[PDB]
Write an enzyme that holds these catalytic residues in place. Structure first.
Site, PDB file in Angstrom:
ATOM      1  CG  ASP A  53       1.821  -7.127  -3.574  1.00  0.00           C
ATOM      2  OD1 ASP A  53       2.796  -7.863  -3.866  1.00  0.00           O
ATOM      3  OD2 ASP A  53       1.983  -6.102  -4.002  1.00  0.00           O
TER       4      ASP A  53
ATOM      5  CD  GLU B  98       0.226  -4.234  -1.293  1.00  0.00           C
ATOM      6  OE1 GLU B  98       1.127  -3.383  -1.211  1.00  0.00           O
ATOM      7  OE2 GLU B  98      -0.188  -4.465  -2.487  1.00  0.00           O
TER       8      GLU B  98
ATOM      9  CG  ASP C 206       9.344  19.245   0.023  1.00  0.00           C
ATOM     10  OD1 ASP C 206       8.352  19.771   0.650  1.00  0.00           O
ATOM     11  OD2 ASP C 206      10.297  18.776   0.630  1.00  0.00           O
TER      12      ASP C 206
ATOM     13  NE  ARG D 248       1.630   1.133  -6.267  1.00  0.00           N
ATOM     14  CZ  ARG D 248       1.251  -0.143  -6.546  1.00  0.00           C
ATOM     15  NH1 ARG D 248       0.736  -0.889  -5.722  1.00  0.00           N
ATOM     16  NH2 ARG D 248       1.454  -0.735  -7.690  1.00  0.00           N
TER      17      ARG D 248
ATOM     18  CG  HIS E 179       4.787  -3.064  -8.992  1.00  0.00           C
ATOM     19  ND1 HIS E 179       5.640  -4.202  -9.048  1.00  0.00           N
ATOM     20  CD2 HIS E 179       4.076  -3.109  -7.836  1.00  0.00           C
ATOM     21  CE1 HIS E 179       5.711  -4.742  -8.022  1.00  0.00           C
ATOM     22  NE2 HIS E 179       4.794  -4.411  -7.113  1.00  0.00           N
TER      23      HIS E 179
HETATM   24 ZN    ZN Z   1       0.324  -4.406  -4.290  1.00  0.00          ZN
END
Ligand code: ZN
Ligand code: CA
Ligand code: CA
Ligand code: ZN
Ligand code: ZN
Ligand code: ZN
Ligand code: ZN
Ligand code: ZN
Lengths: 251, 251, 251, 251, 251, 251
Positions: free
Chosen positions: E175, E149, E84, E70, E45
């Site tokens: 979510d 979620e 990596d 994330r 996001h």
């Molecule tokens: Zn979410």
């Protein structure tokens, strides 16, 4: 403010577009000063990523020209990213079935009706929650266009045209002419007759029809058909062509 | 290989130039494909720094077009930096005396004759010492052009023209017309007569004369005078103009 | 559209400012959404160059907040660059004489009155000549502020205040308190009494007075004195302070 | 944690250094994992600006190697910028008089003793005021090195060596050999005898002596003389040389 | 030194987190100086790519705060890239089945047990093979968190919780509330009761529970339930909110 | 000029390669100066995206070394992007069936024979239509390599080797040794015997065989087997190793 004027004008007037493939904020700003109804930030055929498209949305935001973003493909996570940086109109390449077009509608809408990931606090789309009711109103100003530009796309045209939330079908003459065995030669009557019939069927199903042609005569002919969004040139082609033309006057 | 062909051609032919102010590697590559004799990477009037000029030297290096870099000013440390990233031809703005032009000659040459900082191990100029005798031969392929573009520059013209190691004097019509009280109007006869006389004096002192004009008629007239390096357009002006012209055919 | 509203409002109202030192187009956009009368893009104390300042002008341009750019110093060539990327208001640090303030006025104006280099074709300032009369009208919309923030600045205050084309004098409390032997302690009465007298002298000579204070009580007191442009916080200080405060609720 | 260990070790041990001119945060991190006592981030002969140097300070900061930044010149505003991004050791090129060395000392110290611009709230140097007493303690952890690398430098060597706050004198063999008429041949006895005497005088005046040699025999000879900071290689030269050696095993 | 302290503390203490969506190395360093147990670099996001995330890992690496990345989706090649560049803790969004969670476990482990692509020589993860036994020990310091979620996630909660190598389940309130028909209203009792039961089941299956709430009361309630990793704020929301609050003191 | 010399030399000689994982246009240029037959720009195991790969193609284009691009995976849209920025040779990792290798062939060819998206006007691959017949001749100069580096790859080896348009099969010893239960130990006889047999089968089916080994003795042994394309080292490994070796001479 964040009214999608490109979306409203699909019902209202014919919008003249410029293709933006110079892939940087500075170039997108020059294009934005001209007065095109819309600018296509090309994530499919120009070397763009999410961050370079953001830079170009920020440049263009100061100007009346409306931004349309083409992602590299109908990738649901990439659509999530482009919506969050504040792209209000997307053009999805190579759409080939009602099922794929329905996935794309859902990709642009929040649950429970769609599958757009929710992250409004972090998004330029919400101006970081400075648009108070963003989560309730975002959908109203999102415009989804899909490209028909393959044999399978033409084979699923009536089905794509009955998908609610597809605002517009855009014809890709380069991809379509190649798929039809006329690669590099969309000007052929075989291709043109399919394009014209495709435009008529799009407008008879109550959706907006769009196309790109750098050929001025073909562009004007598409406008006389009532095509709602017509891109009429390409920044890389105009820069190369004008520099070549200038040089030939001195060789 | 790293022969300065722009430098050799000052004695040999008339070189047609394109101004590059789009300020990125991608744009400089498009310009480099056209076939201009030279490309002016503008560090003075486009948003460039050392790193963006490097990117544009790397793009252009694959192509026959020769790179000329204009720094923001005759700053000796900035000249050191631009020479080390491998810029072989510099155009110094706003040069106003024999003493300033001599400082610029010295800025482009290694001690003990000049004051160019020595750091060949680190430099693209030496390809990181992959050019074996770089420190002995670099000077032979460095070309120094200075701009006369002020009243004081015209007041010191004969003196600048007797400075050994100035290869060329470039006339800036925008800066010069403004200095002469005809800002925005270099096309005036008062300005043109001074430009033409300036070109003749430059060529009578055995140096190369250069100029920029986007006006095709003035550019051809400068070429008939024997002007050795003539820039004939500007990438930002050609992109804006062609996009405007295209839009006016549909408004 | 390119009217300098910050410049007009110097005679008209008190303008509340935010310091922008996060040095990126995305952070400058967040700040631009709040509704500050002005945003100081800091090229002296944040890690900015011409290109990062350009990105932040483009972000901010879509919003009513007016951009002011502090260059690293009163460098004539750097002022040329910042004006060409379209910064309409400049805050020059560490100005110390009428001679230096007059150099800065000239640095913001085209010849023959000033020494601003002419390159309108390449400039965002002219929108690449899309503003037709830019070379005739540019100066009307340029605003020059100078900082008094040293003993020698205070020793040349009356002389700086008689320089035509200095729109405003901004007091730097960090630099000034340090020059006065009170480094890190501008809140001291010795410093505050000089700041207040200085503001009164600036307004008595018919110039706009400005200052920064993150201290709310001192900011309100400067607003009660009629100070025309008051910055009231710093993005880096607010990001850090709010993150620390939040963590202390859970340690 | 922000203790300048390089500065302390000037009185304590001999510090082995690597030149970093690959000019990005990724390359600087590779170098940082080797275990050099110091890393010279080269803003003079590598294509670095303030932001690229910041990226390399951030990479290196996780590792015990101490960073030293060479600015392009002894420019007071650029020094201010480099200190604020958190560079604690500076190597000033081409220092030629006690007056210039004194200006550099002042450029690294806050008023009223120095002329370092105050803007701690915005600076990585203070960690955005998270180092509480930064303005009171900053100078204790700032280390100033000056390069002697010209005839005039050697002509002012005793005067430079009595300047309080010059912690170290670094000899530049490339610039110095060039200045002495042995350009590209620092190995000459004429040059080596001047370097050796210069090192002995630096250490007799109680300052730290430094040098760069990629010649292992010369490096070890300088270490046997007690030279306090010896750079022993260059990342660009090691990359190029190792890739050439590997290829010659297969031509 | 490359011990995953976040991973160890999942069994040992409650870890307080800050969301990082300002998406540059400079902003991530500011956040890193506060003292949060963890920092969530948000590739889903916030406008991040692999290179922007690398820059933020490098900034953060000098500081005790542990990084969690994330990715935009549970994409196996993108997971390979993030591992990596040296991300040791990943938070996979929108995980909906034991099969998908098992695929994510495998995506973080080398063959033959997993499907993580092997390229240690090139990786910051191994410090370019400077961690000698990296290929043998890497998995011990890799931590895999998955987000529940969605309705389907809750429908597969028991199955996901029996997947060996899922270290933590993170609840996404934005979510999840959207998916439950309470979009933008996670505070509702219907949603809160599902979150509380979900946390209790995560901890009863012996996995770490995590969540984000910017509501201080909700954050503290989740901490009283024993939630192991609680993010308590978002850098973009704190920047915007602090700047708005400051401005309302002056409107 | 845009002839794929790497592709022609597959039938003609043994091509010595260098792995490029430093992920920047400046490092790629250093490598391009050595004289390697080919340079592998690694988009799978180095932190590259389309834009960083473009920068490195532009650096390398001025030099005889031929560029090969490894994408992160066999992703059709990403292959489209890499071809449009003008990568003429692709190395697809982790190819595991004739079906997948045939998808990759199609991904490199225009319709109607393949599924490469058509956007020649915007592409560096066509030099923005300055290569007149690009759409007719593009495929002649495209070279597709696929990696066999898993058990399922070896289980589909004969089937992959009968796929028309696979120019070469490259063996990944790190991924393959790991898949075989010998992670980090490709030097084992079990692994080496499978590698040698695999090379023999590749050449018996008339395809080019390739491999990487930093082990000189294993690289020479693969060259004695007739292996057509052999990478012989990695830029990151050579930078790190030479810096460590140099430091160990002084510790
Ligand atoms: Zn979410
Ligand atoms: Ca820069
Ligand atoms: Ca990028
Ligand atoms: Zn298409
Ligand atoms: Zn000029
Ligand atoms: Zn100040
Ligand atoms: Zn030197
Ligand atoms: Zn592999």
């Amino acid at each position: 403010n964040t009214v999608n004027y490109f979306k409203q004008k699909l019902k209202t007037e014919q919008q003249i577009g410029m293709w933006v493939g110079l892939a940087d904020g500075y170039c997108a700003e020059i294009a934005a000063n001209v007065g095109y109804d819309w600018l296509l930030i090309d994530g499919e055929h120009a070397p763009n990523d999410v961050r370079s498209i953001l830079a170009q949305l920020q440049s263009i935001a100061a100007y009346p020209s409306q931004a349309v973003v083409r992602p590299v493909s109908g990738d649901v996570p990439l659509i999530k990213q482009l919506l969050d940086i504040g792209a209000q109109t997307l053009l999805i390449p190579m759409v080939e079935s009602a099922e794929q077009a329905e996935l794309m509608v859902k990709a642009t809408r929040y649950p429970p009706e769609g599958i757009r990931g929710v992250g409004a606090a972090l998004a330029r789309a919400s101006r970081w929650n400075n648009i108070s009711d963003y989560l309730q109103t975002a959908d109203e100003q999102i415009c989804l266009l899909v490209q028909v530009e393959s044999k399978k796309g033409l084979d699923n045209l009536d089905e794509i045209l009955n998908v609610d939330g597809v605002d517009g079908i855009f014809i890709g003459p380069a991809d379509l002419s190649a798929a039809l065995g006329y690669r590099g030669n969309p000007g052929h009557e075989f291709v043109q007759n399919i394009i014209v019939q495709t435009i008529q069927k799009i407008r008879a199903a109550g959706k907006a029809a769009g196309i790109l042609s750098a050929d001025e005569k073909l562009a004007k002919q598409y406008l006389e058909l009532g095509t709602e969004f017509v891109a009429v040139g390409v920044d890389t082609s105009l820069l190369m062509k004008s520099m070549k033309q200038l040089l030939s006057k001195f060789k």
